[PDB]
C-alpha cells in the first residue's frame, strides 16, 4: 500500500457488547474480522487521532477487499463490530510506534 506498514497479528479479543444477541453474534463473527492492522509511521500524523482515523479506514477497507473476493458479506452489524475491534488494535499499535519517542 502507499507509504502503510502492517503490523503484527494480535491475539482477538474477547469483546462485550452490552447485549445477549449481540455477544454472541460478535463470539460467533469475530474470527471474520482482521487480526492485525495497517497504519503509517507516527510523524505522518499531527496526533494520535489522525493515526487512528486512519489506520482503522485502510484496515477496514482492505479486510472488506479481501472477503469480498472471497465471496462473503459484512452486515451493517459486522463492520460497527469490526470497527471497534479495529480501533482497540490501532490504538494498541500507536502506542507501540509511541513509546520509542
Known amino acids: 500500500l502507499g507509504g502503510y506498514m502492517l503490523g503484527s497479528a494480535m491475539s482477538r479479543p474477547l469483546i462485550h457488547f452490552g447485549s445477549d444477541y449481540e455477544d454472541r453474534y ?13 497504519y503509517r509511521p507516527v510523524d505522518q500524523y499531527s496526533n494520535q487521532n489522525n493515526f487512528v482515523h ?26 460497527k463490530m469490526m ?19
Open 54 to 79: 486512519d489506520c482503522v479506514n485502510i484496515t477496514v477497507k482492505e479486510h472488506t477487499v479481501t472477503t469480498t473476493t472471497k465471496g462473503e458479506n459484512f452486515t451493517e452489524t459486522d463492520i
Open 26 to 38: 460478535y463470539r460467533e463473527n469475530m474470527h471474520r474480522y482482521p487480526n492485525q492492522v495497517y
Open 83 to 101: 470497527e471497534r475491534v479495529v480501533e482497540q488494535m490501532c490504538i494498541t499499535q500507536y502506542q507501540r510506534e509511541s513509546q520509542a519517542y
